[PDB]
């Protein structure tokens, strides 16, 4: 687990120990466990004397380990100007690539070594060489905020609009990393300000995504399009409002960016600031032009988007300005419906304080109380029933909130609806009562609550079917015994005369019979 003695001598620049070792063992290219020769160590630490000794004793100046890191690569990465010179005079190859296709110029430019980069360029290094991801040395210089390296590479006729495999120009990289000085040099040297990435992202889009305000001002000063869209229709205000960067949003709106723009999903910048919860960005959007009641796909408002995530103070902000809670989607869902689905009690309370109508019904026929009863939201149902909610509201199908609480097996909603007015004697379109559903689904505890509040076990459907008929047909012996102790008639027949024993015979449950 210790290094070979020649590596240790190379690290310490000990030429006497190295000379003794090479007199004993004449191999200067002894390999460590990682496969690095002592020349690699000498190039890393810029130990000139031991490097000259090793090269005079026959060390491979162009040694290539499995990862392809030559000593010239290490000297260029570390900034060892004198070692780079010495290796170049002894025959170091200038175009050799690593496993990720990095040249020594890539290593020099990534770490911003201007002198080394100029030395390699003067020896014929390829300035347009690419890595596995298509990064030229100017990309690596722009990524590291190496202003003078970018300047030197541009002076050596590097392509200012070279793209990576992701179609990223050096301006794109400068905008992504927030290096406004590199971006300034590139744009003053003629870089295109509206270059498109793979997803149609301009450098302005990336600057507005990462809250890089100085890059944004520098781009807009040099003729970047403020209304440029991506493939999805994203404006820089859509990106800034979604990410919540208030300085970017304020600067874009001050300069005259349109705030009522839409994308494929017909979403607006206020929609993305409601769906993300940035109340201050949305507040500034509404001070300027913004349609608070604007509609997207599926007829969704920013109130719909704010109610889904449950961010309460945005709901209060949107509602206080001009938002109308009674607006509904294509499926008929008002923001009260969405808030009741996710159990957002504070959002429901804020919506209800601003005249949200619980009488609004979806296409299926569901009030917000229905949705709470379907999804088991007992805090929302408690708050709705507290303030003007009809427990026996029904649509065309006749389903009440008690129907959908029993159907989805929400005991807490059932135990909350019954004392407040949820009637057990409410028939559906087919005449089914809430006790009909419990008896079929073997909800014994729900049935006990339904029976305790006056549920009738002999209530009949449109075809004469009682809950005892459904319990016996489904083979629920405990349900049948419960109903039979609450005045259920076991001899009662349906329209065709079928008794519960007939329905037991059809399916074959011995314990029920």
């Amino acid at each position: 687990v210790r290094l070979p003695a020649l590596h240790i001598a190379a690290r310490n620049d000990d030429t006497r120990t190295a000379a003794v070792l090479l007199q004993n063992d004449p191999n200067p290219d002894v390999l460590s466990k990682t496969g690095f020769t002592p020349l690699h160590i000498a190039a890393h630490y810029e130990n000139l004397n031991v490097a000259q000794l090793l090269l005079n004793r026959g060390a491979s100046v162009n040694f290539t380990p499995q990862n392809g890191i030559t000593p010239l690569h290490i000297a260029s990465r570390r900034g060892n100007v004198i070692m780079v010179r010495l290796l170049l005079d002894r025959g170091a190859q200038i175009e050799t690539k690593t496993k990720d296709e990095l040249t020594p110029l890539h290593c020099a430019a990534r770490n911003g070594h201007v002198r080394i980069s100029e030395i390699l360029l003067d020896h014929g290094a390829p300035i347009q060489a690419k890595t596995k991801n298509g990064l030229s040395p100017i990309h690596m210089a722009a990524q590291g905020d190496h202003l003078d390296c970018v300047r030197l590479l541009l002076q050596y006729d590097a392509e200012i609009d070279d793209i990576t495999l992701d179609h990223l120009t050096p301006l794109h990289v400068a905008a992504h990393c927030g290096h406004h000085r590199v971006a300034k040099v590139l744009l003053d040297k003629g870089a295109k300000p509206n270059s498109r990435a793979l997803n149609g992202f301009t450098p302005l889009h990336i600057a507005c995504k990462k809250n890089h305000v100085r890059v944004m001002e520098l781009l807009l000063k040099t003729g970047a399009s403020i209304d440029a869209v991506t493939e999805s229709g994203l404006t820089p205000l859509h990106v800034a409002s979604f990410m919540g960067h208030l300085p970017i949003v304020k600067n874009l709106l001050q300069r005259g960016a349109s705030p009522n723009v839409s994308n494929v999903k017909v979403e607006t910048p206020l929609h993305m600031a409601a769906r993300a919860g940035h109340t201050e960005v949305a507040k500034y959007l509404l001070q300027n032009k913004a349609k608070v009641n604007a509609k997207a796909k599926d007829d969704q408002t920013p109130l719909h988007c704010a109610a889904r995530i449950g961010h309460t103070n945005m709901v209060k902000l949107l509602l206080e300005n001009n938002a109308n809670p009674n607006l509904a989607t294509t499926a008929g869902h008002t923001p009260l419906h969405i808030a009741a689905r996710e159990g957002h009690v504070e959002t429901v309370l804020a919506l209800l304080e601003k005249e949200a109508s619980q009488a609004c019904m979806t296409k299926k026929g569901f009030t917000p109380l229905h949705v709470a009863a379907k999804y088991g939201k007992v805090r929302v149902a408690e708050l709705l029933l507290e303030r003007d909610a009809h427990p026996n509201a029904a649509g065309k199908n006749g389903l009440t909130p008690l129907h959908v609480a029993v159907h989805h097996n929400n005991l807490d909603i059932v135990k909350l609806l019954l004392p407040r007015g949820g009637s057990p004697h409410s028939p559906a379109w087919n005449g089914y009562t809430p006790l009909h559903i419990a008896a079929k689904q073997n909800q014994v505890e729900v049935a006990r609550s339904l029976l305790q509040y006056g549920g009738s076990a002999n209530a009949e459907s449109v075809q004469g079917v009682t809950p005892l008929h459904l319990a016996a047909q489904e083979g629920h012996a405990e349900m049948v015994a419960l109903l039979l102790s609450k005045q259920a008639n076991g001899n009662l027949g349906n329209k065709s005369g079928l008794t519960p024993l007939h329905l037991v015979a059809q399916e074959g449950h011995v314990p029920v019979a």
Partner: peptide, 30 residues
């Protein structure tokens, strides 16, 4: 102290093999 660099693990850490690689090209898909 003053002798940790003589070992293969420490020298591998010192040589920083990750700086001779293309790390990634992040996009941060929104």
């Amino acid at each position: 102290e003053e002798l940790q660099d003589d070992y293969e693990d420490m020298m591998e850490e010192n040589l920083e093999q990750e700086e001779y690689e293309d790390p990634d090209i992040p996009e941060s898909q929104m």
